[PDB]
Subunit: 358 residues, 4 copies
C-alpha cells in the first residue's frame, strides 16, 4: 500500500462504531439495561448510545438489519478541512469513497466513508451534535459504568501490510507480538495518547474483533461480571476478567446478542510523547495477553464480526497464510512459557492452567 502524496487527515481519536444488529430490542436490553450506556436518540430502526464522559452525540449506533456486521468504524478528525483531506487521501489510494454533507447517521454532519485498503468501512468526520456531558451525573452512575470509548480491534491477514498503512495515516505503533523467525501476530497503534485507537489482530479478514469501552476502576469491570452472573448470562462472558500484558490494562470480553464482542478496559498508560518506547512481546510468552497466565479462550482467536462494504453487503474474507497465534501457543503443536527458556511453567500442546482446546 503506497504512501499517498496527499496529506493524511489529522485523526483525533476513535469516536463511534455503527453495528448492524438483528433484533433491536434484544440489543437494547444488552447495551442499555445490562451495560448502562446512555441513550442519545432512538427509534424503531436505530439506537444511538454514549458513554458517561462523552460530549459528542454518540459512541455506538445500533442499526437494525438482516445480517449482523460492522457497518462503520468512525474516527473524528481535527478540522472540517480534514474530511476533505481524507477524501483526497483515499481517492489517491484508489479506494471507494462516499461523502455525505449531512452525515450517514443522526448527530454527525459532513462525513466521508471509505472501503479502506484492508476492506474496512472507515468513517471520518468533524461535525457532531454536542450533548450533555454526563461526567458528574453520579445520580445516573452504574456500579459498572462505561465512561469512554477507547478503541477498535480489527482482524486482518497480513499485519505488517496493515501496520504500514496505518502508520502512513498517522497512527503510531505502541506494542506488538512477534516470534523469533520474524512473523507478526498483532500490533497496537494510537492517535490519542493512550495505547491504542485501533489495533490489528492477525487472522482471516476483514473482520471486526471488538469495540472497547473504558471504566474508571477495576471494580467496575468486576461488577459487570457479577451482574452477568445475576442475570444468568455468564455464558456471554467470553474471556477474563484479567490483566493484559500488552497495554497493561485490566480487561473483560463479553458477547452481545449478535455475538459482537465488546471489551471493557481500564488503566493503560500514556503514549503521547513522540519517542514513546515501543514494546514487542514474544508470541510464546504466556504473560503477553493475560499477565496472570490465564489461558486465552479459543473463540477469541477464531470468532469475529463480519464487516460491510458501502452497499451494505458483507466483505469477502481473505485467509491468513502467516502462522496462527492459536496454533503456535495452545494447539497440539503449540507451546508457551512463563519464563523464557524454562521448562518449568511451560505448556506444550495445550493451554495453561491444565486445559486443552475443546
Amino acid at each position: 500500500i503506497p504512501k499517498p502524496v496527499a496529506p493524511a487527515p489529522d485523526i483525533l481519536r476513535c469516536a463511534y462504531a455503527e453495528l448492524v444488529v438483528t433484533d433491536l430490542a434484544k440489543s437494547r436490553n444488552f447495551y442499555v439495561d445490562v451495560l448502562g450506556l446512555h441513550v442519545s436518540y432512538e427509534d424503531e430502526n436505530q439506537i444511538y448510545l454514549r458513554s458517561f464522559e462523552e460530549f459528542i452525540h454518540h459512541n455506538l449506533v445500533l442499526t437494525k438489519g438482516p445480517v449482523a456486521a460492522l457497518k462503520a468504524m468512525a474516527f473524528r478528525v481535527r478540522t472540517p478541512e480534514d474530511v476533505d483531506k481524507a477524501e483526497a487521501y483515499y481517492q489517491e489510494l484508489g479506494c471507494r469513497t462516499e461523502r455525505r454533507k449531512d452525515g450517514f447517521v443522526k448527530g454527525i454532519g459532513d462525513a466521508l466513508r471509505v472501503e479502506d485498503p484492508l476492506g474496512f468501512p472507515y468513517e471520518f468526520f468533524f461535525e457532531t451534535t454536542h450533548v450533555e456531558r454526563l461526567h458528574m451525573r453520579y445520580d445516573l452512575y452504574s456500579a459498572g459504568e462505561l465512561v469512554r470509548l477507547d478503541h477498535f480491534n480489527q482482524v486482518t491477514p497480513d499485519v505488517p501490510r496493515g501496520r504500514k498503512y496505518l502508520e502512513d495515516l498517522g497512527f503510531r505503533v505502541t506494542e506488538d507480538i512477534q516470534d523469533d523467525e520474524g512473523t507478526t501476530y498483532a500490533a497496537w497503534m494510537h492517535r490519542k495518547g493512550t495505547v491504542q485507537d485501533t489495533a490489528l489482530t492477525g487472522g482471516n479478514g476483514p473482520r471486526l474483533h471488538h469495540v472497547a469501552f473504558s471504566t474508571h476502576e477495576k471494580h467496575n469491570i468486576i461488577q459487570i461480571c457479577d451482574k452477568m452472573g445475576a442475570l444468568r448470562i455468564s455464558d456471554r462472558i467470553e474471556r477474563g476478567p484479567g490483566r493484559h500484558g500488552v497495554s497493561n490494562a485490566f480487561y473483560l470480553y463479553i458477547l452481545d446478542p449478535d455475538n459482537h464482542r465488546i471489551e471493557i478496559y481500564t488503566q493503560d498508560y500514556y503514549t503521547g510523547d513522540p519517542d514513546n518506547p515501543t514494546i514487542t512481546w514474544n508470541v510464546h510468552d504466556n504473560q503477553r495477553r493475560d499477565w496472570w497466565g490465564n489461558p486465552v479462550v479459543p473463540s477469541w482467536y477464531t470468532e469475529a464480526s463480519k464487516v460491510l462494504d458501502l452497499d451494505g453487503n458483507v466483505q469477502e474474507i481473505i485467509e491468513r497464510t502467516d502462522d496462527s497465534e492459536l496454533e503456535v501457543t495452545i494447539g497440539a503443536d503449540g507451546f508457551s512459557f512463563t519464563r523464557a527458556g524454562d521448562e518449568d511453567g511451560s505448556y506444550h500442546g495445550q493451554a495453561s492452567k491444565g486445559f486443552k482446546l475443546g
Copy 2:
C-alpha cells in the same frame, strides 16, 4: 456414622493457625514473606511464625522444616482454658488419639491439645496464646496486597455427609453445600465465627488439606497479588482465579506455595452468625456455583491437595472416595454443566466452560 458424644463439645471461637511442614525454609519464607507480605512474629533455623495484618494472637501460620511437606496441625482457638479439657474429653469419647501439652506444641501457644480426628486430620485446640502488636492501623507497613486475617481451612475427605455430621456435633453450622439430585454431597462449608466458614469439606481422597485461606480488605488487593506474581514471573504459581465464588459470594484467588500447599486469598463473604442462617444448596451441574462468572474450574483444584500428618509425624494413609467425582460429573468426558437450569443454550457436555477440555 460418627456418634454424638455425651461429653459437651468445646466452645470453638474460630480457626486460628495452621502448621505446615515445608522442605526448604528459605524458599518458603520468600513466598510467604517477600511475595505475600505476611508479618514475622518469630523465626529461627527450623521455623517461621507469621501473622496477618489485623491479628493480635502470636501467629496465623507456622512453617516448620521437615522431610515431607504436609499439614502438621490445623488449630482452632477455644473460648476458655476449660474448653481445652472439654476438647480432650470429647475426642477421647470419640475414640481418637490425643496429645496434651501444657506449654504448647509451637512457640506462642500455651496449653494445647492435638488430636487425630475421626476423619484423620490433625486438629489442635488451644486458648492460651502470646499476644503481639496488632498491626491493624500500621499503614506504614500496609502492602498493596495485604493479607488482613486468617479466614478458613478446607479439607479433602471421601465421605462428606459423614464428616459434616461430626462437625455439626462439634458445633459448626453448615452455611452452604453442593449436592446433586441423586443424593450425593460433593462439598460443604461450616462456621463458628459468623462468616461463611472456618473449615470446609471437599469430596475426594483423604485426609488431605485442600487449602488455607487468608482475607484481604478489598478486591483490588487480590488483583495486586496476581499482578505482583506476574511481575515476579511466577504466574505459573497462580492455580485458579481470580474470580467470584457462587458458594460464599467471595472474591477469590488460589495460589501454590513452593511445596504445592494451596493458599486461597478471599474477601467479602456474608454474615452467618444467626442460628437460623439460611443454608444454601447448589446443584453440582450449576456452572455458576464455584465461579459465578462461569469460568472453568482447573482440574488440579479437584485432584491435588496436601498430605497430612498423624501425631507421630508420619503421613496419614489416603482413603479413596467412592462417591461420585465432582470433576467427572461436571467437566469430565461424561460430564455436564448448565448456565440456566433446563436450558440447552449455555450448557456444556463432556467438557469445561469457555471452550476448554481437560488437559
Copy 3:
C-alpha cells in the same frame, strides 16, 4: 449505679433493626430508597420496611409516619425464643417498664419484648422474624453506593461509665473508648457480634439517638454516596466525612435524613470475637482518634441527635450531661488537641484542626 440482676442476661446476637418515626413518609422514602438504594420488604401508607443487600431477616429499618421524628425502637436479635423470656425477666428485675407482644410490634417480627431501659432507651428483643429473599448475589440490583448490612447503633447518654457497666452486665464487650487524664470517659464502643460495635455510647445530653450505621463492601461505595449527593445538589446533607476513624479503624461518612436522623455509612473495621480482644483507649485530645487524618469534627456531630420515644409514644425527657464536653475540651474556645503527644507542633489551641474554628 445500675445493679447486676440475678436473672441471666438474654443471649444477644447482634443489632437487627431500628424503627424511626418520620414526618413525611414520601420524602423519607426518596432518601432511603432513591438516594441510598435500600430494598423495600413491605410498604403501605403508614410504614416502609427496608433491608440491606445481604439481609435475610425481614427488615433492618422501619420508617413509621408520626407527628414527631424520633427513635421508636432499637432492636436486637436474640439467640433463641427462650431468650425473649430471659430479657423480660432481666428487665423486670431491673425495675424497667416492659411490654411483650407474641405477634410483634411491627410486620415481619414475631414474639417481641420492648423495654424502657435504664438509660431511657426503647430497646426491643426478638427471635422470630419472617425470612425474605437474601439479595446478596442480586448484582442486577446492586447500586454503586450499595448498603450491604446493618452494622450498629450509637446512643447519646450523659454518664458513660454508668451506661457502660449496664451494657457489660447485659453481655456487650467494650472494644474501644475515649478518656482523658482526669478520669472522664467521653465515649465507649461495645459488641456482641464479632465486630467493633453493635451499640456505642457517646457522652451528651440524653437519651438521644446519635446514629444508625450501615456497611458497604468497599471504600469507593462510600465515596459514591458523596458523589451522588453532590449530583443531586444535596451536599448540605453530608454532615461529616468521608474519613478514616481512629476508633474502629473504619472508613466512614455521616449524612442526614429529611428529619435530621443521622445515618453513618461504614466499612472495614476488625474482628473482635475473641474474649480477650485487646481493648483500646484513646485520649480525648488526640486529634487522630475520631478522624485518623486529623480532619476536624464538625460541631453538629457533638450537639445534634434524635429524640427517642417511651413505650406510650411520647418523647423521653432529656437529662443534661455534667461531665466535661468533648466539643468544649477539643475544639471550643478553651479546647486543645494534638497530633503527636507532647509536641506543640501540630497542636491546636482554642480551635479546630486544619485552620478552622467554630
Copy 4:
C-alpha cells in the same frame, strides 16, 4: 497585555518535571521516597532525581539542596529538538530573560532553555532526555499509595486573564474556570496533553507555585496516602481533602512536604483532546465547585504557596492581587456560598460550610 509573538510557539507536549529547592535533603528524601514511594533515578549529596511508576523519561521531580526553599524550574517537554530554538526565539521576542544550555541544567536532560516568563515563573523547555526503565508493570515495586504519573502544575498569579491569554498564545487550551457575575476570574485550568490540565492559574499574590500534582490509578491509592500519614503521625501535613473536585471531577488530596511545598495527589479527570472540548465555568459562590461534597476549603490553601527563583537563584518579588479574593468572597466575614443557586437553605454567609469559620 502580553502581545502574541510573531515567532511560532514551541509545540509543548506536557508538563514533565519540577525542580524544587529544599533545605534538608535527607528530610525531603524521607518524604518523597519513604512516605510517597517515588522512584530514584539518580542521587548524590546535593540532588535527588525521582520519577513516577509509569514514566520513561529520566525524572519527574528533582530535589536540589539550597538555602531557601523555592521552585527552581517548572519544565515542559516539547515535541522536537527544534522546538527548543522556537522557545528561545518566542521568549526573546517577549523580552524575557533566557538561558540556553546545550547539555542541560539537571542530569538526564539534554539541550534545554530556561526563562523568566512574563508572569515571573522559571519555565524550562526541553526535548532530549535520558530514557530509563519504565516501571509500569513492576508490580513487585508497587506501593499501596503508588504515584503513577506527573499530572500538572498550579501557579499563583495576581491577574488571571492576563496569564490566561499568554498561555493560550503558547498553545494551552482552557478547560475550566471560576468566575463571578461581576466578571472577575478567580482561577483557570489549561492543557496540552489530553487531560484537564498541564498547568493552572490560581488568583493570588505571585509569582508563587501553588502545587505540583501526581496521579494515582484509583481512589483507594489516595486514601492509603492519608492512612499512612496517620500511622506516621504526620496527619498535620494533610492540608486539604481527600475529596472530589468540582472543577476537573478528579478525586484529590493536598499534602505538605518538609519545606511546605504543596503536593496534590489526583485521579480520574476526563478527556479534553478534541479541539471543541466544552469549556466549563463555575460561579465562585458555588460551594460544590472546589469540593463537590461541599467540604470547606481550608484558608491556608488560598493564602500559602511556594516562592519561585529567578535565573540567578534569587527569590522573585511578589506582586499583590488587586482583583477580589476567592477566600474573602466565599468564606470571609463578608463572603458567602450556596449549595443550590438561589436557595438560602444550604447557603453559608460570613463563614465556611459544615459548621466552621476561619
